[PDB]
Ligand binder design. Structure first.
Ligand code: A1LZY
Lengths: 254, 10
């Protein structure tokens, strides 16, 4: 039942992610506190994270963001039909290599040309402010904004994105998988439901499915490059300690 | 067991 599988994945997405594209669009219109310079960064910190260099404080907020998202993605994955029937070690492998591809795809839903929603929708940090930071911190988000602006031009909705994220997670290509064949069959079913869904939901764009296959490849390269920046920071920055869960994810990634 | 494995087992 392909329509059932799609509905179940979409409901799991709506249940487990605090932010989605509809919610983000409602906020990003007709009020989040705007962080556009050092004064407003310090103001936002006193109101939103009341508990060090500005770039390093932002770095810690960004880690806290990602840790929560990894938790949401793990719950989402456990609700993907068939995922919990996989070898537990393969589930770990799929999440390890999949979470950041999923994170950067879903970041697009909270990004526009001027900045991004942060802190559970209560803040908006500008793209120009991020570029203004000292190296290497100013080099982290720009490729993600670039990816997002092209991704958002596909005009996907949450029903599309939920299937796309499920496809990212259920990927038989990952290094170290024990049960490659079973995961491949899982992925084939999810990709088949994604293909059918895009044809139904986007009859105007007959190449949308191969465009999204290419975005999956682009996301893999984006994550590889991001991990290289993680390593630059961990070994050259005095005060930027990695959260242990994110350290586990990046360890022996690429 | 890893932190990730702990998340999956919860
Ligand atoms: C390369 C190091 C890694 C952390 C190991 C990192 N470094 N950076 C990073 C750091 C400093 C910056 F200057 C800009 C980006 C990140 N950014 C991310 O996603 C962005 C989510 C995000 N959250 C906030 C925020 C801001 C204020 C209050 C609350 C939240 O702002 C943004 C851009 C996600 C990651 C991630 O690999 O997990 C990340």
């Amino acid at each position: 039942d392909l329509k059932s599988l799609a509905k179940r994945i979409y409901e799991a997405y709506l249940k487990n992610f605090n932010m989605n594209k509809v919610k983000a669009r409602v906020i990003l219109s007709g009020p989040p506190f705007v962080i556009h310079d050092m004064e407003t960064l310090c103001m936002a910190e006193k109101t939103l994270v009341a508990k060090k260099e500005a770039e390093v404080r932002i770095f810690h907020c960004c880690q806290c963001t990602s840790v929560e998202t990894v938790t949401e993605l793990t719950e989402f994955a456990k609700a993907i039909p068939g995922f919990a029937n996989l070898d537990l070690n393969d589930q770990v492998t799929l999440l390890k290599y999949g979470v950041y591809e999923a994170i950067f795809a879903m970041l697009s839903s909270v990004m526009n040309k001027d900045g991004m929603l942060v802190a559970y929708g209560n803040g908006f940090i500008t793209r120009e402010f991020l570029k203004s930071l000292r190296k290497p911190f100013c080099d982290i988000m720009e490729p993600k904004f670039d990816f997002a602006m092209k991704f958002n031009a596909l005009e996907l909705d949450d029903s599309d994105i939920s299937l796309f994220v499920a496809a990212i997670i259920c990927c038989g290509d990952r290094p170290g998988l024990l049960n490659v064949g079973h995961i491949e069959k899982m992925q084939e079913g999810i990709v088949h439901v994604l293909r059918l869904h895009l044809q139904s939901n986007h009859p105007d764009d007959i190449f949308l499915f191969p465009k999204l296959l290419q975005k999956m490849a682009d996301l893999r390269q984006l994550v590889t490059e991001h991990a290289q920046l993680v390593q630059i920071i961990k070994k050259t920055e005095s005060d930027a300690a990695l959260h242990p869960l994110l350290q586990e994810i990046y360890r022996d990634m690429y | 067991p890893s932190l990730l494995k702990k998340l999956l087992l919860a």
